[PDB]
Amino acid sequence: PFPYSIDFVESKQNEQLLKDFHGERTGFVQVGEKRWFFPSRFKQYAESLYSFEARPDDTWIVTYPRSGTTWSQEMVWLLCNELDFETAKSIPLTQRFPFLEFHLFVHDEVKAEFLKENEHDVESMKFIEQLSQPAGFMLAEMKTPRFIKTHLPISLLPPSVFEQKAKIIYVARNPSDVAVSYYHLNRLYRTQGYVGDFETFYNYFEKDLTPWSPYWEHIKEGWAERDRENVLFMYYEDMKRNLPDTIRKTAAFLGKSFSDDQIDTMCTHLDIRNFRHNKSVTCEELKAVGILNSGEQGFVRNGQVRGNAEEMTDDIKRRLNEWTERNLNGTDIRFP
Ligand SMILES: COc1cc(C=O)ccc1O
Numbered sequence: 001p002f003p004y005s006i007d008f009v010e011s012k013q014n015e016q017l018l019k020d021f022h023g024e025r026t027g028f029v030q031v032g033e034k035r036w037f038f039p040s041r042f043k044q045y046a047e048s049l050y051s052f053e054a055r056p057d058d059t060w061i062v063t064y065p066r067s068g069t070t071w072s073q074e075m076v077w078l079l080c081n082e083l084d085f086e087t088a089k090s091i092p093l094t095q096r097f098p099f100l101e102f103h104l105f106v107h108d109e110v111k112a113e114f115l116k117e118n119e120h121d122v123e124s125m126k127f128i129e130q131l132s133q134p135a136g137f138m139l140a141e142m143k144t145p146r147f148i149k150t151h152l153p154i155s156l157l158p159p160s161v162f163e164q165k166a167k168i169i170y171v172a173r174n175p176s177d178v179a180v181s182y183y184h185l186n187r188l189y190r191t192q193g194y195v196g197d198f199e200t201f202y203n204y205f206e207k208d209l210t211p212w213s214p215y216w217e218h219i220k221e222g223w224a225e226r227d228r229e230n231v232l233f234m235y236y237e238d239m240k241r242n243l244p245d246t247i248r249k250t251a252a253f254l255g256k257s258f259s260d261d262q263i264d265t266m267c268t269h270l271d272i273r274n275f276r277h278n279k280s281v282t283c284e285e286l287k288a289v290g291i292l293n294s295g296e297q298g299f300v301r302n303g304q305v306r307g308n309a310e311e312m313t314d315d316i317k318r319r320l321n322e323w324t325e326r327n328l329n330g331t332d333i334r335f336p
């Protein structure tokens with residue numbers, strides 16, 4: 001029984017969101033007292049998501065979007081699979097490490113556009129149809145240890161995750177870098193279909209009118225569970241600053257042990273320079289059927305000027321600082 005209220009965003013705000021986010025064609029919902037923001041299909045799939053059955057040997061990565069999710073998945077999959085770089089290369093990350101709630105973001109009307117554009121290729125059309133289907137079906141059929149990605153906040157996870165004490169890695173990233181990276185994600189994925197500029201996107205983000213917001217509640221729930229034996233909480237900028245420490249700490253939490261030589265191959269694999277050429281970054285299959293906007297691969301290839309993105313203005317930077325102050329005053333949460 002899904003325990004939280006699911007309500008359509010107020011009419012006029014919902015109308016404006018549909019003008020700016022072309023990946024949704026019915027409307028947006030707010031869930032529970034915290035008003036977790038999702039596209040309309042959340043209402044259709046809330047029960048099946050919440051009743052998903054976790055196993056005690058699952059590995060879950062839980063993040064706010066663009067909080068180091070992909071890099072962490074690649075790291076964790078390799079640590080739990082004997083550093084099998086060969087298999088990591090040949091199977092796509094999205095099959096090795098499926099995204100539980102991706103199907104929420106494939107609207108029936110948008111899927112129909114994708115199918116039109118791929119109508120002469122039977123295998124492209126099967127692929128697009130499967131995107132619509134819950135990952136949970138294929139996850140439930142697996143007979144081996146599972147790797148699950150989600151952006152669902154702690155309070156919306158299947159309760160079976162904590163009942164089974166599945167291992168959870170929670171990664172937090174500072175709001176400035178998340179605002180800019182999430183803005184690019186919303187332009188890159190036609191499932192989101194955002195058409196506007198950064199300042200308009202920041203305005204939505206600051207009002208918790210972007211998927212999986214409220215951002216500060218997402219971070220605070222992660223922080224509130226980090227003492228549990230089955231939760232590892234890390235800040236993105238700590239992880240990136242020291243790969244050998246990150247790899248070892250993560251391995252030890254997962255109950256794996258590796259030589260200094262093995263740690264070094266993982267450090268090279270995950271280094272900024274080599275990771276830019278990783279298949280999990282390029283995402284060549286979503287690009288092949290045109291669900292990725294190929295005109296938005298600038299940010300993918302280049303990233304942002306560290307601590308001063310081209311998109312940032314002094315006014316938005318000031319608003320980020322004040323929003324951070326309001327949300328973190330009286331907590332011990334502090335970004336590196
Ligand atoms: C497959 O990666 C993502 C895609 C989207 C939107 O369709 C949102 C968050 C993600 O992590």
Ligand SMILES: [Cl-]
Binds near residue numbers: 174335
């Ligand atoms: Cl950070």
